[PDB]
Structures are given as C-alpha cells and as structure tokens.
Amino acid sequence: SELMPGSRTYRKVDPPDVEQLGRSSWTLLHSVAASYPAQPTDQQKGEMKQFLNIFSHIYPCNWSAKDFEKYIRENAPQVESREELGRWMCEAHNKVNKKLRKPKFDCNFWEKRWKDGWD
Amino acid sequence: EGLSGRKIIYDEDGKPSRSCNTLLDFQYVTGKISELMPGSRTYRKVDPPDVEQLGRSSWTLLHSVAASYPAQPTDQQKGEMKQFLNIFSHIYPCNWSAKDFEKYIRENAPQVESREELGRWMCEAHNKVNKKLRKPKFDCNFWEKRWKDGWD
Numbered sequence: 001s002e003l004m005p006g007s008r009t010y011r012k013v014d015p016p017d018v019e020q021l022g023r024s025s026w027t028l029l030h031s032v033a034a035s036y037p038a039q040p041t042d043q044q045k046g047e048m049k050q051f052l053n054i055f056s057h058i059y060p061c062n063w064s065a066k067d068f069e070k071y072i073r074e075n076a077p078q079v080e081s082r083e084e085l086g087r088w089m090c091e092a093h094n095k096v097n098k099k100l101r102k103p104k105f106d107c108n109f110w111e112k113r114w115k116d117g118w119d
Numbered sequence: 120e121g122l123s124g125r126k127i128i129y130d131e132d133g134k135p136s137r138s139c140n141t142l143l144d145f146q147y148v149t150g151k152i153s154e155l156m157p158g159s160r161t162y163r164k165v166d167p168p169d170v171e172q173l174g175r176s177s178w179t180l181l182h183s184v185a186a187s188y189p190a191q192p193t194d195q196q197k198g199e200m201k202q203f204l205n206i207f208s209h210i211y212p213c214n215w216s217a218k219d220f221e222k223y224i225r226e227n228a229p230q231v232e233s234r235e236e237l238g239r240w241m242c243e244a245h246n247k248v249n250k251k252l253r254k255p256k257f258d259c260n261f262w263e264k265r266w267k268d269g270w271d
C-alpha cells in the first residue's frame with residue numbers, strides 16, 4: 001500500500017500467501033509446458049524430469065511440496081511431447097482442485113488457456 | 120493457537136507460518152497472539168500470460184524459493200538449487216530473455232551457500248533486468264521484508 005524507504009515506486013507489499021504463490025507457480029508451470037517442443041531432445045526430456053523433481057523439493061509450502069513429490073511417484077510425468085507434458089500438467093493441477101473443491105479444468109482447452117488464446 | 124478457523128487448516132512452522140496459509144487467515148492468527156469456457160460454468164476463457172505477467176509470476180516464485188532456503192543448507196540443496204536455476208535459464212518460455220539470464224549465470228555464478236547469499240544474489244539478478252527495463256533499482260536490504268517475514 002504505502003511506499004518503501006527510499007523508493008518512489010516499490011511499495012510495502014506483503015510476502016505471497018498460498019493463493020498468490022499458487023497462481024504464480026501454476027502460470028509458470030503451464031507456460032513451461034506450452035513452450036516445450038513437440039519433439040524434445042534427450043537433454044530437454046532429462047531436464048524436464050529434473051526441474052519437476054527439484055520443484056517438489058523446494059516449493060515454499062512444505063507439505064504441498066511433499067504432496068507434489070508423492071504425486072510424481074504415483075503419477076510419473078510424461079515428458080515425451082508438449083501435448084503429453086501439458087496434459088499431465090493439467091491433470092496434476094486438477095488434483096489440487098479436487099482437494100480444494102474447485103471445479104475440474106477441461107484439459108482439452110489447456111493449450112488455448114496457456115498457449116494459443118481463443119481466436 | 121487456532122487449529123481450524125474460517126473453514127481452512129492452519130500450518131504452523133515453528134509457530135506462525137506464511138506460505139501455506141491464506142492472507143485473511145494469517146492476520147487472524149497473528150492477531151490472536153496479541154464469459155465462460157465450454158463445459159464449465161466456473162472458468163472464464165482467459166488469454167495466456169504476456170511477458171509482463173509471466174515475468175512477475177516467475178519472480179514471486181523465485182524469491183519465495185530464496186525465502187524458504189535454509190540458513191545452513193545441506194550439500195544436496197546447494198547442488199539442486201544450482202541445477203534448478205540452470206534448467207530454468209534453459210526452459211524459461213521467453214527465449215530471448217532466457218538466453219540473457221543464462222549468460223548472467225555464466226558471468227555471475229549463483230551464491231547458494233546460505234539464504235542470505237541467495238536472496239542477495241536473486242535481488243541483484245532481478246535488479247539487472249530492472250536496469251535493462253529502465254525500472255527503479257530495488258534495495259536488496261529489504262528483500263527479506265518483501266518476500267519472507269513481512270513488514271512487522
């Protein structure tokens with residue numbers, strides 16, 4: 001709300017809660033999926049697996065990071081194509097929605113929501 | 120300390136916690152110390168995030184990652200953090216920006232020995248983009264207040 005000393009721009013905005021961090025993490029995760037190649041190289045396939053493994057270790061919320069890691073074991077990420085990684089990212093997201101009684105996102109429209117837009 | 124209130128479950132760190140609890144509920148505890156997408160009525164059709172939206176959404180995570188970082192991290196956490204930033208610099212959606220950030224890591228290696236080192240590094244990295252975009256230079260001495268603790 002009110003400014004920092006001694007900035008004439010940056011304000012005393014509080015550290016993110018679950019919701020502010022959540023939608024910010026989802027927008028990155030889904031945007032990474034959208035930028036993923038149709039035919040990824042072995043290095044890209046390896047790093048995508050790594051990034052998500054590390055992600056589940058360091059996520060700011062601790063047992064949400066555990067829940068995500070446990071999800072990765074029970075549901076291995078498909079990194080063979082953008083379409084698979086994106087659909088997997090949507091299905092991974094859909095589980096958190098189910099836990100929060102938020103409606104299911106139609107994964108048929110993940111590529112519009114995160115890559116293409118709607119005409 | 121309240122276990123349940125306002126419908127949701129409270130996570131407690133040493134005591135207060137921040138990242139795992141909603142804003143309205145966090146105040147509640149610290150105060151106690153004294154058109155639509157087809158097939159769904161719920162989700163509006165939303166255009167994908169632009170450079171600016173993705174950018175600031177990536178920063179809030181990256182600094183929150185620095186905020187959660189331990190004071191004395193294990194050797195695994197140091198190496199994983201290093202990889203995390205490298206992989207990030209490759210797979211960051213904006214290619215022309217990702218290549219720049221990758222070059223920054225080459226020239227200015229991440230200091231991951233402590234949270235104090237990492238937040239200071241992250242702030243400087245953010246500040247380099249700040250100068251490139253002609254935004255004001257953020258005071259790193261206040262990164263903890265902005266991203267970790269709050270403003271008392």
Ligand SMILES: Cc1cc2nc3c(=O)[nH]c(=O)nc-3n(C[C@H](O)[C@H](O)[C@H](O)COP(=O)(O)OP(=O)(O)OC[C@H]3O[C@@H](n4cnc5c(N)ncnc54)[C@H](O)[C@@H]3O)c2cc1C
Binds near residue numbers: 065091097105
């Ligand atoms: C890994 C992870 C674990 C989390 N765990 C918890 C937790 O345990 N408890 C908790 O309270 N919060 C948790 N969160 C935060 C939570 O998931 C939400 O992000 C937060 O509650 C804010 O939700 P929102 O209503 O603003 O929209 P969000 O759920 O953040 O989604 C933002 C936008 O993305 C789109 N979207 C939603 N679902 C999908 C999907 N299936 N596929 C494609 N697009 C979609 C929608 O259009 C929506 O507008 C977690 C977040 C992450 C990233």
Ligand SMILES: Cc1cc2nc3c(=O)[nH]c(=O)nc-3n(C[C@H](O)[C@H](O)[C@H](O)COP(=O)(O)OP(=O)(O)OC[C@H]3O[C@@H](n4cnc5c(N)ncnc54)[C@H](O)[C@@H]3O)c2cc1C
Binds near residue numbers: 013170171217241244
């Ligand atoms: C790795 C990376 C590289 C990027 N490269 C480019 C690029 O090359 N060109 C481009 O146009 N865009 C780039 N972006 C996006 C750009 O940095 C901004 O995020 C975007 O322009 C939105 O700016 P903003 O002013 O709305 O918020 P941001 O500049 O993203 O800042 C968000 C919040 O963080 C806080 N903050 C600001 N500076 C610091 C700091 N130094 N340390 C700690 N906290 C701070 C402030 O409170 C601010 O409200 C990049 C993003 C990332 C994550």
